[PDB]
Amino acid sequence: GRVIRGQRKGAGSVFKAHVKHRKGAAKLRAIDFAERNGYIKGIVKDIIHDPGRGAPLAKVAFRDPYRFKKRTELFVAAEGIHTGQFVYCGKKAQLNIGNVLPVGTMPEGTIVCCVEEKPGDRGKLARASGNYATVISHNPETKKTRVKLPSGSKKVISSANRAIVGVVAGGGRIDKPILKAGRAYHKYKAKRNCWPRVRGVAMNPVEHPFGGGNHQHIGKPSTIRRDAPAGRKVGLIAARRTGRL
RNA sequence: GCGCACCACCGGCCCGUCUCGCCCGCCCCGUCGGGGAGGUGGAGCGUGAGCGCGCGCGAUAGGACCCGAAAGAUGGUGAACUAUGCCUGGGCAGGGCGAAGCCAGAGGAAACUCUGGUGGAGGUCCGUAGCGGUCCUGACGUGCAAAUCGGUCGUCCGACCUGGGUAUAGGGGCGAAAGACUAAUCGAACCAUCUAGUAGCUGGUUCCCUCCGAAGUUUCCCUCAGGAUAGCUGGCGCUCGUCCGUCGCAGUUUUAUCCGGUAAAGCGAAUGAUUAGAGGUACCUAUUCUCAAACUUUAAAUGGGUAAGAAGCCCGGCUCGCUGGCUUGGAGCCGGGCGUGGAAUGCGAGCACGCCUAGUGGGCCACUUUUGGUAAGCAGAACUGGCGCUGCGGGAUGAACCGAACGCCGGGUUAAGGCGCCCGAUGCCGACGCUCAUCAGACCCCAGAAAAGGUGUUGGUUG
RNA sequence: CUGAAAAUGGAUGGCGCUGGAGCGUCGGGCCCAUACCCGGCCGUCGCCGGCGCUGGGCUAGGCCGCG
RNA sequence: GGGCAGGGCCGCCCUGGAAUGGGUUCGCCCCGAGAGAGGGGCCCGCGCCUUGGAAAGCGUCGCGGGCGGCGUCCGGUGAGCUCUCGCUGGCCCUUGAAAAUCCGGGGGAGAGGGUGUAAAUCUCGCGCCGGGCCGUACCCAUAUCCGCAGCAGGUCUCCAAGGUGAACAGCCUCUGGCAUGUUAGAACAAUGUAGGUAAGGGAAGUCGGCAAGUCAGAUCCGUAACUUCGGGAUAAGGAUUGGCUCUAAGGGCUGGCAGCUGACUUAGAACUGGUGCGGACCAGGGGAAUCCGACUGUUUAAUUAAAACAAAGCAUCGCGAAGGCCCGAGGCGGGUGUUGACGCGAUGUGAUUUCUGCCCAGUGCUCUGAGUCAAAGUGAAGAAAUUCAAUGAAGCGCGGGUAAACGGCAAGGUAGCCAAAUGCCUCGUCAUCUAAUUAGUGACGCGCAUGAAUGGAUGAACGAGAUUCCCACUGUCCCUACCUACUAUCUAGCGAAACCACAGCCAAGGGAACGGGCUUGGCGGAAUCAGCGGGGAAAGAAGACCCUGUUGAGCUUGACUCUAGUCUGCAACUGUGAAGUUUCACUUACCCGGUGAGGCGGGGGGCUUCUGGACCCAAGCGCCCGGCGGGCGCGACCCGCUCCGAGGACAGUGGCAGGUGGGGAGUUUGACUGGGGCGGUACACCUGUCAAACCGUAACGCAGGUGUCCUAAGGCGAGCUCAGGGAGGACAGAAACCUCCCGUGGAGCAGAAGGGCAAAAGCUCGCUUGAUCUUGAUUUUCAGUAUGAAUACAGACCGUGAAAGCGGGGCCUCACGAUCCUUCUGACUUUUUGGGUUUUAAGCAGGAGGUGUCAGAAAAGUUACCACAGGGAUAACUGGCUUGUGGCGGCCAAGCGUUCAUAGCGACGUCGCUUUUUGAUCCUUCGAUGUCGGCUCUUCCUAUCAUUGUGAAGCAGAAUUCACCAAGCGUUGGAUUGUUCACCCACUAAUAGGGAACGUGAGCUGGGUUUAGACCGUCGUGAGACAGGUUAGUUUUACCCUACUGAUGAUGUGUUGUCGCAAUAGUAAUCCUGCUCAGUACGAGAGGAACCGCAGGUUCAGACAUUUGGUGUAUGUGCUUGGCUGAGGAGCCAAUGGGGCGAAGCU
Ligand SMILES: [Mg+2]
Ligand SMILES: [Mg+2]
Ligand SMILES: [Mg+2]
Ligand SMILES: [Mg+2]
Ligand SMILES: [Mg+2]
Ligand SMILES: [Mg+2]
Ligand SMILES: [Mg+2]
Ligand SMILES: [Mg+2]
Ligand SMILES: [Mg+2]
Ligand SMILES: [Mg+2]
Ligand SMILES: [Mg+2]
Ligand SMILES: [Mg+2]
Ligand SMILES: [Mg+2]
Ligand SMILES: [Mg+2]
Ligand SMILES: [Mg+2]
Ligand SMILES: [Mg+2]
Ligand SMILES: [Mg+2]
Ligand SMILES: [Mg+2]
Ligand SMILES: [Mg+2]
Ligand SMILES: [Mg+2]
Ligand SMILES: [Mg+2]
Ligand SMILES: [Mg+2]
Ligand SMILES: [Mg+2]
Ligand SMILES: [Mg+2]
Ligand SMILES: [Mg+2]
Ligand SMILES: [Mg+2]
Ligand SMILES: [Mg+2]
Ligand SMILES: [Mg+2]
Ligand SMILES: [Mg+2]
Ligand SMILES: [Mg+2]
Ligand SMILES: [Mg+2]
Ligand SMILES: [Mg+2]
Ligand SMILES: [Mg+2]
Ligand SMILES: [Mg+2]
Ligand SMILES: [Mg+2]
Ligand SMILES: [Mg+2]
Ligand SMILES: [Mg+2]
Ligand SMILES: [Mg+2]
Ligand SMILES: [Mg+2]
Ligand SMILES: [Mg+2]
Ligand SMILES: [Mg+2]
Ligand SMILES: [Mg+2]
Ligand SMILES: [Mg+2]
Ligand SMILES: [Mg+2]
Ligand SMILES: [Mg+2]
Ligand SMILES: [Mg+2]
Ligand SMILES: [Mg+2]
Ligand SMILES: [Mg+2]
Ligand SMILES: [Mg+2]
Ligand SMILES: [Mg+2]
Ligand SMILES: [Mg+2]
Ligand SMILES: [Mg+2]
Ligand SMILES: [Mg+2]
Ligand SMILES: [Mg+2]
Ligand SMILES: [Mg+2]
Ligand SMILES: [Mg+2]
Ligand SMILES: [Mg+2]
Ligand SMILES: [Mg+2]
Ligand SMILES: [Mg+2]
Ligand SMILES: [Mg+2]
Ligand SMILES: [Mg+2]
Ligand SMILES: [Mg+2]
Ligand SMILES: [Mg+2]
Ligand SMILES: [Mg+2]
Ligand SMILES: [Mg+2]
Ligand SMILES: [Mg+2]
Ligand SMILES: [Mg+2]
Ligand SMILES: [Mg+2]
Ligand SMILES: [Mg+2]
Ligand SMILES: [Mg+2]
Ligand SMILES: [Mg+2]
Ligand SMILES: [Mg+2]
Ligand SMILES: [Mg+2]
Ligand SMILES: [Mg+2]
């Protein structure tokens, strides 16, 4: 049989991301001497909408600590910030919404976003609209902080991972029911070519493991193993359990 | 009498192997090497016949008599059609209902309600362009057109329509998913090559004449549309014979002697089935009715085997390690003597009916016999003939029936079948009867009749 | 003769036949098959075939004879 | 270019200060963060004027590339139409490009001259010079492009007049364009294609209201059930509509009410007419329900627009980046990812509302720590190869969880729902719907085989979806007719194609079982025209259906054998150190992240949180060099080995090993067979029979057996005699044991059967291992090969008996297996390759391990998405043989008929016929005979329902029954169903039965069936299947030959014409009612005829148009809409403008 739809996405021909009108990569500043030994004053110049993501992006401007240059960054806009606000980045910056602080220099239970997964990755965790990470506890011996991710998992990261205090703006976006199919079309028309999802039971056996039969049954158990080959790994991949929770 | 070649048979020898064994040899005396006797395995020996060349045929492997697949593989070319994403442009009358927001006037004790207007929302409605393509299953249907035309119809601010520029390439692409679409090609494109792919399967296979002439059956086969094998065929011969005579031969009789368990018969005989009384005391005896394919005491017809001499008979001896009371057997061998060849008839035989060998291995039909089946122009056997391979006369006609089989002709005579005319032959003064039919009847196979009836007519029988 | 009814118009073969061209029993005569008899020609096959002993003859791989 | 209108600054300026808040728009909006007002400023000014500039251009009048005259003017309006510039708002889980290029500002390093200039000057204003290369024609589409073409197809745009009207609708005209689309003339037949009308009835047509028609615009009214409150809705149902003549209402400007001036509409009224008025054009039929899908959207280009897909919603699953998912031959590869759980990826269900039950056994997924377990490694034995042992990963196994996982209902179908798109029986039962209903709806539910995200139930709105009814409408129909246009037709010119063995009149017979040719008959007359669709089993295509092939392909799995990927283990890359094979540490390989690798580590010295500003290119000091300039240091600490961090000898890499692996690859999926499959094994064997007296002899013939059993049930000897019966004998009996007698085997002999068998072959007993070691020959199946199983010897060694003898398995006939490979035994001058020794390996010989498809491949499906080679060797459709079955008819006479066998019947039996049932068969056809029904239409049969003429009765009349001559004539209209077949409603003289390739598809219709789409049920793990249901699904060609229908003509008697004859062929009328006979005959009554006669009708036939109706393009005459001809008048155009009436003709 021919390859399944799930296999053609890794080729990257028509399933690539629509990144034409995107305003840039949202990431923190480069970790320098100003943020490891003090703070640097920024200024929010504009809060823009990035096509593809439901969270706004802030165009924060900084001064280059070594050249007469205006460094403009693109952060994930925390909810509550506005244009004209002075945000600060570093370990000696105060605990305010929008400031970029290490996760080790903050009290427990601090709500932060855009958390660096590794020290200096310029922010990876909790960057979607309406999400945040909570600093659970610290460990001054190993210099490791334990953070609670939006998925409920508690990850032990380094205490030097910077993060933006607050919650990512654009929260409550999923609380609105998309009423039309056209609204869902425009939602993914900027993301990628994946919205109209034909059921595997509606296809033919050549195109999908679940296709075929005089009826549209699945036939085989929908719970597939983890080590299934590409082309058979459909349905519920490595499902620990099934049924209504 | 010497006997060629050849053949039957019996010795003999070589190698393997087996059984039983008592001798022998030596410088390299040993777990040494040799030989005997009797069976047996071998593509042996037994005073070579091969080799080279050419011709022909046969079975093969090669494109392999020619043409033909659905496929498979390697490499490559296509997104000018179309499917989808992206980029950059273009385009989308006139009307209907009329959402939030707003204004005003009212009602009310208050909360709050009501009315008018305004506003112009929406995968809204009618609908043009556009894009689609419902129904007529209309037109056309060797068309205008390898998908079009007309009316009608869907939608027409949206998941809308479209050009251009780009992206994805064949077991891949893409797919709001029809196995759709990917250049009139898609349940795996196109191009060239591998490739003259293979085919137990269809089709075809080119001059004349002479002579001979089949098989659809046996066994085996992942066989049953096919092969292998045996049979049937042809060719090539060869060994002899070829007046009587003698060898030899036979789809035949005769004589002699065996074999069988079918028809018929039997069950008052066995086994099995079965009817009715009778006698003696439900049985028991003697009877009685009806039967067998997997019953039988009996038992044919047809049919099968053998024999009908010289490879014999007769007389006299020899060999043996087998046999043994004893030449006692048995078999072999030797010498001599004896054709009236030791049934009829016909006939040339032999070489494992030699050597090579094509075709065939779908059969079919009839008398009789016979199985399944209500039956069948049904299915399945035995035997013989026939058709197929075969024309001819006759049955009007027709692969099989009847007669008879075939070079080219003349005369004659017939077969089966015919002789009113078609149509050769009764254009006999044929014989004897039978029969009237308002559906008469008119002859193998054979191509429509039954049970039951008639005071039609003609015979006969018993009263 | 009754019993005896199928669909295009039709099949002793047809015409037709009733002192028979019907049925049964027979007689004489007659008709013709590539069958049988005799004869011619052609070929094949078989002759323990014939001829080297010449008007003709014997290209013997020829000629001739017989069935 | 300049100037000025005009427009915009709710985005600017100054004054000032607001509530009695004001300003203001179509809408909004605006203001103490400052309104209103006044006065300014800026941007855009494509407008006007003007330089250009009228000299040119144009119109017109002249005159001779030109000369001239004159004119080119003054105005006024707008929801007008396009274009453009602004203002302002709405919508997005949609935020709707980059770069070249150009400009402004911040900063002030520097530059410039020392008293008139210098630096400098943004086209400031002018002057001077240069601007290369390529493309440029024309078509741009009913003839310049593509589709083989001058092809009714296709192919991206730009500009857009008047009238009507809401309109870029339709219709008419102007500018512009064209010649009717690759020909013309004549005629006006059939049949067509397109358009239209039709009286009376109104779906009776048909599978089905298919097609057609009705409705339609606007205005004023009136608008239910239901609902998600949005809708339904143009619901439905009504009225009005012309022309003309008026009235009233809705503005602006100027002057302070007056004057002037509109241009677009509404409302009311009068008059008027052949009641006609959205007059043409344009332009929804409606309602009551069921089924499915929520909707909009999308889909098989070229047969399926759907109930399919999608969809929002719902739910589940994976994953925190060293990741999930996926690509990839390969890398520090690539996609999602410019991403980060409100994310991405994988599925299921399918809006809302309402619920979503039970089962974790099976399969699958997932989660745990106590038998199996590879390579490597360790240990042991051995000369070594080798062998053995221990250890022993993942995975499996064990255990838990999981069903909005597959599924089922280990659990036994809960809530619901239903004879449903799902119910076999079935046309279920009941009610309703109709005169009549296999349909529809509402109910009933042990439901063949409903059922809950394999989703159950409901449901407004919506639908080119399926279905039922009603209203309205209509030529769908009763029942056809007429008119118009283009064809056909004829002529001029032009001019193909399919097809074709030869060809073309039939009946019957036979035949390859449906001839055109042969046979026997009928008979047959040139050359042709227009038609026609009976025939040529017509053409079109080496049947796609069925089967075969040791031919494939698509797809699927619990098929065979592999594989990418993935998991896991070992050593290598792989270093350092500590502690008890593990853990904590080290960095240095390796790995990841960040950055323009910008401040690291160790010492010394001593700094930014109020604001949408600004921030660099050292001030200062110290030192030094030049003739007013320049340089250096400090300012800004020193030193240093990895840029800084996160990992780290683990990830990872390469190489082996195990697991997993339809993701993928290759292949396979026996044969026989009254088609095939299913079943069976008739596939290797045995007995009886078939089998026809040797042997042999077939079928999916008949009745059975076999894949064993036996240390004796083998071998030998000896003794003994069985089954059963009679008579007896304590318990003891119909059967216990003892005795006698009879007992041809009637018992037994392992088994199926047959044969054989009595001091045997049976039974019992005691000695045994001839069931041993060998060679060859022979028999049977046979090819006379093998195997299997047998026969008779011989040579050994034994058993047994006193011995003769008997015995190398079973009393005989069945009870079994090649090569290769493995294993065992035995033997020897056997090999182990230059010799020797010992291991090992090989060989010889004999057994065993097994191929049951049994002379011996290694083997699951599915295909309707299918393909090829073929096959009438072989199925489904006709015909042919057969007639079991079906239908029909005799014979015999038990009996029925109150009595009486035969008026009418006919049991038990029995004989036939028919080919309108079905079956059987497989002869014809698979290089194709279109296949069900209906419609249409003709002819035929009689086994007569009715009519005609009769006979019979359990015939009084009437009605009816039976039978005869008899097929001339007729056998109907409807509901339901695709249906033939049934059933019912009526009508009728009767509503008889059949054939003709189950007549009739180049006649039709596609309803059924019968491709591909899709749903449901059952079934299968699955792909799929289902003669179960349901929905949508291309019906091609005649001009050829005959046949038939008509039309010319041909025929020979001289030509020609009129008037006739006539063979032969066709043939046609039919049934009924009323009245009278007649309330008569007959009968007790009730009832109730018949002949003649009479008046009409039904069906059919041939005509015909006086009349009535219909058509009507005499385009005849009126009316009228839109437009046009300046108006009237007269007319035209709108593919027949529409409508009224209408001659002739046809009907
Ligand atoms: Mg599908
Ligand atoms: Mg499936
Ligand atoms: Mg299932
Ligand atoms: Mg292959
Ligand atoms: Mg509507
Ligand atoms: Mg349209
Ligand atoms: Mg169309
Ligand atoms: Mg059509
Ligand atoms: Mg046509
Ligand atoms: Mg519509
Ligand atoms: Mg494009
Ligand atoms: Mg390739
Ligand atoms: Mg399909
Ligand atoms: Mg001959
Ligand atoms: Mg034969
Ligand atoms: Mg053949
Ligand atoms: Mg042969
Ligand atoms: Mg052969
Ligand atoms: Mg054959
Ligand atoms: Mg037969
Ligand atoms: Mg047969
Ligand atoms: Mg033959
Ligand atoms: Mg012969
Ligand atoms: Mg005959
Ligand atoms: Mg003669
Ligand atoms: Mg004759
Ligand atoms: Mg009688
Ligand atoms: Mg008769
Ligand atoms: Mg002669
Ligand atoms: Mg400056
Ligand atoms: Mg210049
Ligand atoms: Mg041009
Ligand atoms: Mg043209
Ligand atoms: Mg024209
Ligand atoms: Mg009418
Ligand atoms: Mg009807
Ligand atoms: Mg219609
Ligand atoms: Mg309604
Ligand atoms: Mg319902
Ligand atoms: Mg829909
Ligand atoms: Mg289509
Ligand atoms: Mg699910
Ligand atoms: Mg489980
Ligand atoms: Mg229930
Ligand atoms: Mg109805
Ligand atoms: Mg119902
Ligand atoms: Mg459930
Ligand atoms: Mg629709
Ligand atoms: Mg013919
Ligand atoms: Mg045909
Ligand atoms: Mg074929
Ligand atoms: Mg085969
Ligand atoms: Mg395929
Ligand atoms: Mg496969
Ligand atoms: Mg295959
Ligand atoms: Mg088979
Ligand atoms: Mg016999
Ligand atoms: Mg012996
Ligand atoms: Mg056949
Ligand atoms: Mg019968
Ligand atoms: Mg009877
Ligand atoms: Mg009759
Ligand atoms: Mg009808
Ligand atoms: Mg038919
Ligand atoms: Mg026909
Ligand atoms: Mg047709
Ligand atoms: Mg038909
Ligand atoms: Mg249909
Ligand atoms: Mg279908
Ligand atoms: Mg009376
Ligand atoms: Mg007018
Ligand atoms: Mg027009
Ligand atoms: Mg018109
Ligand atoms: Mg009229």
Coordinates of C-alpha atoms (C1' of nucleotides) in Angstrom, one line a residue, chain D residues 834-1067:
Chain D
rG834 C1' 54.3 -34.8 0.8
rG835 C1' 54.8 -39.1 4.9
rG836 C1' 53.8 -41.0 10.4
rU837 C1' 50.7 -41.1 15.0
rU838 C1' 46.2 -39.9 17.6
rU839 C1' 41.3 -37.1 17.3
rU840 C1' 37.8 -35.6 13.5
rA841 C1' 35.5 -36.0 8.9
rA842 C1' 34.4 -39.0 4.7
rG843 C1' 33.1 -43.9 2.5
rC844 C1' 31.1 -49.3 2.2
rA845 C1' 27.2 -52.5 4.1
rG846 C1' 22.5 -53.1 7.1
rG847 C1' 18.4 -50.6 10.2
rA848 C1' 15.6 -46.3 11.7
rG849 C1' 13.9 -40.9 11.8
rG850 C1' 8.8 -39.5 6.2
rU851 C1' 6.8 -37.7 3.0
rG852 C1' -1.6 -40.4 4.2
rU853 C1' -1.8 -35.4 -2.2
rC854 C1' 0.6 -42.4 0.6
rA855 C1' 6.3 -43.2 -7.0
rG856 C1' 7.3 -38.9 -1.8
rA857 C1' 7.1 -29.4 -3.6
rA858 C1' 8.2 -26.1 1.7
rA859 C1' 2.8 -23.0 1.4
rA860 C1' -3.5 -18.5 4.2
rG861 C1' -6.8 -15.6 2.0
rU862 C1' -9.4 -11.7 -0.8
rU863 C1' -10.8 -9.1 -5.4
rA864 C1' -17.5 -6.2 -8.0
rC865 C1' -11.2 -2.1 -8.8
rC866 C1' -9.5 -6.6 -11.3
rA867 C1' -6.0 -8.3 -15.6
rC868 C1' -4.2 -12.1 -19.4
rA869 C1' -4.2 -16.7 -22.0
rG870 C1' -8.0 -19.7 -23.3
rG871 C1' -12.5 -22.9 -22.9
rG872 C1' -19.0 -24.1 -25.4
rA873 C1' -13.7 -29.9 -22.8
rU874 C1' -17.6 -25.9 -18.5
rA875 C1' -22.0 -22.9 -15.4
rA876 C1' -26.0 -18.8 -15.8
rC877 C1' -30.3 -16.9 -20.7
rU878 C1' -33.1 -19.7 -25.8
rG879 C1' -33.6 -24.1 -28.5
rG880 C1' -33.0 -29.9 -28.5
rC881 C1' -33.7 -35.1 -25.8
rU882 C1' -36.3 -36.6 -21.2
rU883 C1' -41.4 -35.7 -18.1
rG884 C1' -39.6 -37.2 -12.0
rU885 C1' -42.4 -32.9 -10.7
rG886 C1' -46.2 -29.6 -12.7
rG887 C1' -50.6 -29.3 -15.9
rC888 C1' -54.3 -32.1 -18.5
rG889 C1' -57.3 -36.6 -20.0
rG890 C1' -58.9 -41.8 -20.0
rC891 C1' -60.0 -46.9 -18.0
rC892 C1' -62.0 -50.4 -13.6
rA893 C1' -66.1 -49.3 -10.3
rA894 C1' -65.7 -49.4 -3.8
rG895 C1' -68.5 -45.4 -2.6
rC896 C1' -71.1 -40.3 -2.8
rG897 C1' -75.5 -38.7 -4.9
rU898 C1' -82.3 -39.6 0.9
rU899 C1' -83.2 -44.7 -2.3
rC900 C1' -80.1 -45.1 -7.6
rA901 C1' -72.4 -47.3 -9.2
rU902 C1' -71.6 -44.0 -14.1
rA903 C1' -77.3 -36.7 -13.9
rG904 C1' -73.0 -34.9 -11.8
rC905 C1' -69.0 -37.2 -9.3
rG906 C1' -64.6 -41.7 -8.7
rA907 C1' -61.5 -44.2 -3.4
rC908 C1' -58.1 -48.5 -3.9
rG909 C1' -55.5 -49.2 -8.6
rU910 C1' -54.1 -48.3 -13.6
rC911 C1' -53.1 -46.3 -18.8
rG912 C1' -51.8 -41.9 -21.4
rC913 C1' -51.0 -37.0 -23.2
rU914 C1' -48.9 -32.0 -23.0
rU915 C1' -44.2 -29.0 -23.1
rU916 C1' -47.5 -22.4 -20.9
rU917 C1' -43.9 -25.3 -14.2
rU918 C1' -39.6 -27.2 -12.3
rG919 C1' -35.9 -30.6 -12.5
rA920 C1' -32.3 -33.7 -15.1
rU921 C1' -28.8 -33.4 -19.0
rC922 C1' -24.6 -30.2 -21.2
rC923 C1' -25.6 -31.2 -27.8
rU924 C1' -25.2 -25.9 -30.3
rU925 C1' -23.1 -20.7 -28.9
rC926 C1' -17.8 -17.7 -24.0
rG927 C1' -12.5 -13.8 -31.2
rA928 C1' -20.6 -12.1 -27.1
rU929 C1' -27.4 -14.8 -30.1
rG930 C1' -28.2 -8.1 -25.3
rU931 C1' -30.9 -10.7 -20.3
rC932 C1' -36.7 -9.5 -16.3
rG933 C1' -41.2 -7.2 -16.7
rG934 C1' -44.3 -3.6 -18.8
rC935 C1' -45.8 -0.8 -23.1
rU936 C1' -46.7 -1.4 -28.3
rC937 C1' -48.3 -4.7 -32.3
rU938 C1' -49.5 -8.8 -35.5
rU939 C1' -50.6 -13.7 -36.2
rC940 C1' -51.3 -18.7 -34.2
rC941 C1' -53.1 -22.9 -30.8
rU942 C1' -57.9 -24.9 -28.2
rA943 C1' -57.3 -28.0 -23.2
rU944 C1' -64.6 -22.9 -25.5
rC945 C1' -65.2 -18.2 -20.4
rA946 C1' -68.9 -15.4 -23.7
rU947 C1' -71.6 -15.4 -28.4
rU948 C1' -73.8 -19.2 -33.0
rG949 C1' -76.2 -24.5 -33.7
rU950 C1' -77.1 -29.0 -30.6
rG951 C1' -77.2 -33.4 -27.1
rA952 C1' -77.6 -34.5 -21.3
rA953 C1' -79.5 -33.7 -16.2
rG954 C1' -80.9 -35.0 -9.6
rC955 C1' -83.2 -29.5 -17.2
rA956 C1' -91.0 -27.2 -14.4
rG957 C1' -89.9 -21.8 -15.4
rA958 C1' -85.5 -18.8 -14.3
rA959 C1' -80.5 -19.6 -13.2
rU960 C1' -76.9 -23.3 -13.5
rU961 C1' -74.1 -27.9 -14.6
rC962 C1' -72.1 -31.8 -18.2
rA963 C1' -71.0 -32.8 -23.3
rC964 C1' -70.7 -31.9 -28.8
rC965 C1' -69.7 -29.1 -34.0
rA966 C1' -66.8 -25.0 -33.3
rA967 C1' -61.2 -20.3 -32.4
rG968 C1' -65.5 -16.5 -36.7
rC969 C1' -65.8 -12.6 -32.9
rG970 C1' -64.7 -10.6 -28.0
rU971 C1' -62.3 -11.3 -23.4
rU972 C1' -62.2 -4.4 -20.4
rG973 C1' -61.2 0.1 -16.8
rG974 C1' -58.4 0.7 -11.9
rA975 C1' -55.8 0.6 -6.2
rU976 C1' -51.0 -2.0 -4.3
rU977 C1' -46.5 -4.4 -6.2
rG978 C1' -40.4 -3.6 -10.9
rU979 C1' -42.7 -8.0 -10.5
rU980 C1' -44.7 -12.1 -14.3
rC981 C1' -47.8 -14.4 -10.4
rA982 C1' -51.5 -12.9 -6.8
rC983 C1' -55.3 -9.8 -4.4
rC984 C1' -59.3 -6.3 -4.5
rC985 C1' -62.5 -2.5 -6.6
rA986 C1' -66.1 -1.7 -10.1
rC987 C1' -68.0 -2.6 -15.1
rU988 C1' -69.4 -6.6 -18.5
rA989 C1' -72.3 -11.3 -22.9
rA990 C1' -67.6 -13.1 -20.7
rU991 C1' -64.0 -10.6 -18.0
rA992 C1' -61.0 -18.4 -21.0
rG993 C1' -56.1 -20.5 -21.2
rG994 C1' -51.3 -20.3 -24.1
rG995 C1' -47.4 -20.2 -28.0
rA996 C1' -44.4 -17.3 -31.6
rA997 C1' -35.6 -17.5 -29.3
rC998 C1' -40.1 -17.9 -21.4
rG999 C1' -42.6 -13.3 -29.4
rU1000 C1' -41.3 -8.3 -29.4
rG1001 C1' -34.3 -3.3 -26.2
rA1002 C1' -30.3 -0.8 -34.2
rG1003 C1' -39.1 -0.6 -31.1
rC1004 C1' -39.4 1.9 -26.4
rU1005 C1' -39.2 2.3 -21.2
rG1006 C1' -34.7 1.0 -17.0
rG1007 C1' -38.6 -0.1 -12.4
rG1008 C1' -36.0 -5.0 -11.2
rU1009 C1' -31.6 -7.4 -11.9
rU1010 C1' -26.6 -6.5 -13.5
rU1011 C1' -19.8 -2.9 -12.7
rA1012 C1' -17.6 1.0 -10.1
rG1013 C1' -20.1 5.3 -5.0
rA1014 C1' -22.7 4.7 -0.2
rC1015 C1' -25.8 2.9 4.3
rC1016 C1' -27.8 -1.1 7.6
rG1017 C1' -28.2 -6.1 9.4
rU1018 C1' -25.7 -10.8 9.8
rC1019 C1' -20.5 -12.9 8.8
rG1020 C1' -15.0 -12.6 8.7
rU1021 C1' -9.2 -10.7 13.1
rG1022 C1' -8.8 -8.6 8.4
rA1023 C1' -9.2 -7.3 3.1
rG1024 C1' -14.2 -8.5 1.9
rA1025 C1' -18.7 -11.5 1.3
rC1026 C1' -24.3 -11.9 1.4
rA1027 C1' -30.1 -14.9 -5.0
rG1028 C1' -30.5 -9.8 2.8
rG1029 C1' -32.5 -4.8 2.4
rU1030 C1' -31.7 0.3 0.5
rU1031 C1' -30.1 4.8 -2.6
rA1032 C1' -27.7 7.0 -7.0
rG1033 C1' -26.1 4.8 -11.5
rU1034 C1' -23.9 6.5 -20.4
rU1035 C1' -29.4 1.7 -23.3
rU1036 C1' -24.6 2.8 -29.3
rU1037 C1' -25.1 2.2 -35.4
rA1038 C1' -29.2 1.0 -40.6
rC1039 C1' -27.7 4.7 -46.0
rC1040 C1' -26.5 -2.4 -47.2
rC1041 C1' -29.5 -7.4 -48.5
rU1042 C1' -34.3 -9.6 -48.0
rA1043 C1' -39.1 -9.1 -45.7
rC1044 C1' -43.2 -5.7 -45.4
rU1045 C1' -45.4 -0.6 -46.7
rG1046 C1' -46.6 2.2 -50.5
rA1047 C1' -44.1 4.7 -55.5
rU1048 C1' -42.0 4.7 -60.9
rG1049 C1' -41.4 1.1 -64.5
rA1050 C1' -40.6 -3.6 -66.8
rU1051 C1' -42.6 -7.3 -69.6
rG1052 C1' -45.0 -9.4 -76.2
rU1053 C1' -48.8 -9.6 -79.4
rG1054 C1' -46.8 -2.6 -84.9
rU1055 C1' -47.6 2.3 -82.4
rU1056 C1' -51.3 4.7 -79.3
rG1057 C1' -55.8 5.6 -76.6
rU1058 C1' -60.6 4.7 -74.6
rC1059 C1' -64.0 1.3 -72.8
rG1060 C1' -64.2 -3.7 -70.3
rC1061 C1' -63.2 -9.0 -68.8
rA1062 C1' -60.8 -11.6 -65.1
rA1063 C1' -57.2 -15.8 -62.9
rU1064 C1' -55.4 -15.2 -58.3
rA1065 C1' -54.8 -12.9 -53.6
rG1066 C1' -57.1 -10.1 -49.5
rU1067 C1' -61.9 -10.2 -47.2

